[PDB]
Nucleic acid binder design. Structure first.
Length: 927
RNA sequence: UACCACCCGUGCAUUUCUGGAUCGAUCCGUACCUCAAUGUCCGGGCGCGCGACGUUGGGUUUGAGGGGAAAU
């Protein structure tokens, strides 16, 4: 028998294992997976693709502006039209005019019709709203997007009014609806006359928005009902400076925030009433709602931070009880009404116009940088006018004195901040910094400095674990701000984009240290309020409203400058991105089966078989594969599928873009395989596994759902010394995305494996479920985890051509996290298959583990363990091929005396020992 | 069993058919994205210029994962 190291629960074999485990599931759902088939085009053919008509079509479909479908739909809704599944529209409701947010207006108009809405839960509200707006399975839009659009675009306003019996009062609401309809362009892509085929995706985005909005509104009804007046944080809590460190506001500021919250609770009851359609200005209601939500978010965040600090303090208290008594004196509660209503994403689409956007962002980066420099200059001038000079070292010495209640310590802190920015920098920048610090000789061991900047490990300054030893005289001698300025200048001279980014970062760091030197004074509002058009958090806005501001709030406004500049830097540093257009129709997928032009020697073993392939082999006399399939079609019609799967063939897709002229027969769901016909198409590229999936469809094992054509236009960006960016368009790439339902052709319950997620790998202990006794214990190490933790910099730097221009942040690290989760899950599944056992995971990922490692483990845990959160549950179901619930035949949970619910993972060398312990805890649970 | 040896990073490359039918054999299927490995580059750290000291350590799979689109 293969040891686990040689065992191969991988690829299609692991998909088959997952599928059999899912067949054992007591509760499951039908799941699809989308496979991407790169179409094969030659360079001339790719050049001949014109993505302009496609971009027009995508803007009309996915756009939220004028001349898009969303605009026309919203206009119909606000004109006083009600949507009916089977002309699919009628004029009933009174027209709603003057709503800046059309989606919000629609949701409110539909909700006005609903009665006794407050008892209705978020889910029910969403359902009713979407039924009213999109008419189940988007049936009304079939008329409106095709024939209706033609009617509104080509029908006198008076005639429209006469047809739908509309009174003269609503004539205005109608005129914009007619004008919006006319503004829509003409669909030319995919051989489609009108927008009706695309109607599914529109329906779907609108429905997701409806659900989210309804859920938010009901969470707030709940919050407003729960508001209990007079909750206040104890004065003692506020007084504890240690507990306060890192709430980013003052105690007085927090009390002001709670009073603001009660006034806005009143305002929000009123605003939610207005949004459910009771009446009044939807736009004002929206602003009120958003402000209150932001307030309630900031308050909750602050409270959670304070609670975490409290928990840490309690953990440290330990044996000492005086500290515990002080903690009970400061003890605070988080009110149930306080609860984060997070910011909600609006409907957004179309494709970004790269060149216009790049001009805008060059301009913006230049402007923001100039403004930041000017602001810094102004702050410096105000402090100088008063007559006390900013000095980072003096300020740091004062801070150290306050913390005790030194010049060396100040210098050490400055050097440490510079060092952290250089840890964040590229290898060449790290090298420059290291060389310069060795030339200065401040570090006792240049080795320590090298390690700190390159290996990102160690600390030069500790804040009351030993800080790095330094030559004090040399340290007092070398200024650090000038060193930073020189490094920045040299990196800008390097004129390499990584080096330019590092220069920008170091300049920001220097400005930040100079500002940290500010004395403890009152500063006017003028210096404090950012002129960069940046969005500001509630706490900072409340601090800013006050005429006199502290050093820390001025620092925070400078940090806002820094953040805008950093986003603009990410936008100008990128060398590669793509503009992607996805088109999906309602029609069934037609593939083209093209038989290869060759001579096929069918096997003689095929000849003697009793299967469909055997029958087909018997009838064939022809020597060319097209002739052979025609022969099987004529003689053994049932045997066609298996013969076709085995014969020489290629898969093609028309894509309505021209392509190779081929002699092929269409393969379509439900319909029988067609007669050979002259068809055009683009060959679909894929490996043997993907081609096997399509072959299975011929037999009847796989079903293909509606196709999605993704066109990507690749772009390259270059930045000159002045930072103007130039963008160049690559040849377009077309791909077909196919959702596939695969019938699973006809163990978990017999044993159970306890999985421990350790820092360097995983540990497993396998216990027989019936006797609850250990069979074998072991450790499996994960190169992929260790590798991720190490190559963080490569991932960040990796150019992604695929990454969209719209993206405002780097997500290469997130994609790598996805691959890591994949790999750990693979190891767990492999162990399970080897022992025929069900996974047991620790319910809670340990807090001690590093951020990224912790996130990976949480994802792994979700993929197996049962969790309440919908996202987690959906991920787990998708991973387990539709398996939502399992029931154990002989295991009963001791606590409720109910048969074990497995999903299929139950919830409960160092790694090995910890896994045996988890297994033991699960054993104790079930008894 | 055999195999291979300080620990990593950074940049640049190269490679990976990994799915089926039928009775090991014959024939279909052409190979996408990502990671990884490997090679190389330059740069750290550690032990005593170098790099495991018969005995150790490490890995072993048909390298691994792929559910999109939207978003964040």
């Amino acid at each position: 028998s293969i040891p686990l190291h040689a065992f191969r629960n991988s690829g299609a074999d692991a998909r088959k294992w997952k599928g059999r485990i899912a067949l054992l599931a007591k509760r499951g759902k039908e799941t699809m997976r989308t496979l991407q088939f790169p179409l094969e085009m030659s360079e001339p053919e790719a050049a001949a693709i014109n993505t302009t008509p496609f971009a027009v079509a995508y803007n009309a479909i996915e756009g939220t502006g004028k001349g898009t479908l969303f605009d026309y739909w919203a206009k119909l809704h606000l004109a006083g039209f009600r949507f009916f599944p089977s002309a699919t529209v009628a004029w009933h409701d009174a027209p709603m005019s003057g709503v800046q947010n059309l989606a919000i207006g629609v949701f409110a108009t539909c909700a006005s019709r609903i009665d006794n809405i407050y008892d209705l839960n978020g889910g029910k509200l969403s359902k009713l709203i979407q039924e009213s707006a999109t008419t189940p399975n988007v049936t009304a839009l079939s008329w409106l997007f095709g024939k209706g659009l033609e009617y509104f675009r080509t029908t006198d306003i008076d005639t429209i009014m006469q047809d739908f019996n509309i009174p003269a009062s609503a004539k205005e609401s109608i005129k914009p609806l007619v004008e919006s309809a006319q503004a829509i362009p003409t669909m030319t892509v995919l051989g489609k006359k009108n927008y009706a085929p695309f109607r599914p995706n529109f329906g779907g985005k609108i429905d997701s928005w409806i659900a989210n909005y309804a859920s938010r509104l009901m969470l707030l009804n709940d919050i407003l009902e729960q508001i209990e007046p007079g909750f206040e944080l104890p004065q003692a809590l506020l007084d504890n400076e240690t507990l306060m460190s890192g709430i980013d506001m003052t105690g007085d500021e927090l009390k002001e925030l709670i009073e603001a919250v009660y006034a806005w609770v009143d305002a929000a009851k009123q605003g939610l009433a207005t949004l459910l359609g009771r009446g009044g200005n939807v736009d004002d209601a929206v602003q009120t709602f958003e402000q209150f939500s932001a307030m309630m978010d900031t308050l909750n965040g602050t409270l959670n931070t304070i609670s975490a600090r409290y928990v840490r303090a309690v953990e440290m208290a330990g044996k000492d009880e005086a500290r515990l008594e002080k903690l009970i004196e400061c003890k605070f509660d988080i009110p149930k009404w306080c609860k984060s209503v997070p910011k909600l994403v609006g409907i957004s689409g179309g494709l970004p116009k790269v060149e216009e956007e790049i001009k805008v962002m060059n301009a913006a980066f230049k402007d923001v940088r100039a403004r930041m420099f000017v602001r810094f200059e102004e702050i410096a001038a105000y402090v100088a006018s008063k007559g006390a000079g900013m000095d980072v070292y003096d300020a740091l010495e004062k801070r150290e004195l306050e913390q005790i209640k030194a010049h060396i310590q100040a210098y050490r802190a400055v050097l440490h901040r510079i060092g952290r920015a250089v840890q964040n920098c590229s290898e060449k920048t790290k090298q420059l910094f290291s060389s310069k610090v060795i030339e200065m000789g401040v570090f006792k061991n240049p080795s320590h400095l090298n390690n700190f900047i390159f290996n990102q490990k160690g600390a030069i300054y500790r804040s009351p674990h030993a800080p790095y030893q330094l030559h004090a005289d040399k340290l007092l001698k070398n200024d650090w701000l000038e060193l930073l300025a020189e490094i920045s200048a040299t990196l800008m001279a390097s004129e390499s984009t990584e080096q330019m980014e590092d220069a920008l970062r170091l300049e920001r760091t220097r400005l930040q240290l100079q500002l940290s030197g500010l004395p403890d004074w009152e500063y006017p509002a003028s210096l404090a309020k950012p002129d960069i058009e940046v969005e500001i958090q509630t706490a900072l806005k409340m601090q800013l409203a006050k005429d006199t501001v502290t050093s820390d709030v001025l620092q925070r406004a400078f940090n806002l400058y820094s953040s805008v500049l950093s986003g603009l830097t990410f936008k100008l540093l990128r060398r590669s991105f793509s503009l992607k257009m996805r088109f999906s129709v309602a029609d069934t997928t037609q593939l083209i089966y093209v038989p290869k032009v060759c001579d096929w020697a069918i096997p003689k073993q095929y000849l003697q078989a009793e299967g469909e392939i055997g029958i087909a082999a018997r009838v064939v006399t022809e020597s060319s594969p097209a002739k052979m399939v025609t022969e099987v079609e004529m003689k053994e019609p049932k045997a066609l599928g298996h013969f076709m799967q085995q014969a020489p063939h290629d898969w093609y897709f028309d894509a309505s873009l021209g392509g190779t002229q081929v002699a092929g027969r269409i393969v379509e769901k439900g319909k029988e395989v067609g007669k050979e016909r002259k068809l055009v198409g683009y060959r679909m590229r894929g490996n043997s596994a993907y081609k096997t999936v399509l072959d299975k469809s011929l037999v009847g094992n796989t079903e293909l759902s509606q196709c999605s054509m993704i066109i990507e236009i690749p772009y390259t960006q270059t930045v000159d010394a002045d930072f103007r960016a130039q963008v160049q368009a690559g040849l377009p790439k077309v791909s077909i995305n196919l959702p596939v339902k695969e019938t699973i052709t006809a163990m978990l319950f017999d044993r159970f494996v306890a999985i421990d997620l350790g820092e360097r790998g995983l540990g497993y202990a396998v216990f027989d479920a019936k006797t609850l006794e250990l069979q074998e214990s072991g450790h499996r190490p994960i190169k992929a985890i260790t590798n991720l933790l190490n190559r963080t910099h490569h991932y960040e730097q990796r150019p992604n051509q695929r990454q969209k221009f719209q993206a405002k942040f780097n997500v290469n690290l997130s994609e790598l996290r996805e691959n890591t989760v994949g790999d750990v899950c693979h190891q767990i599944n492999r162990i399970c298959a080897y022992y025929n056992a069900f996974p047991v995971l620790e319910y809670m990922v340990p807090d001690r583990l590093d951020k990224q490692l912790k996130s990976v483990y949480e994802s792994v845990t979700n993929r197996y363990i049962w969790s309440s959160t919908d996202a987690h549950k959906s991920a787990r179901v998708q991973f387990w091929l539709g398996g939502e619930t399992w029931e154990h035949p002989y295991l009963k949970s001791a606590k409720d005396k109910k048969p074990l619910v497995l999903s299929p993972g139950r919830g409960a060398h160092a790694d090995e020992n910890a896994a045996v312990n988890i297994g033991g805890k699960f054993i104790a649970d079930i008894e």
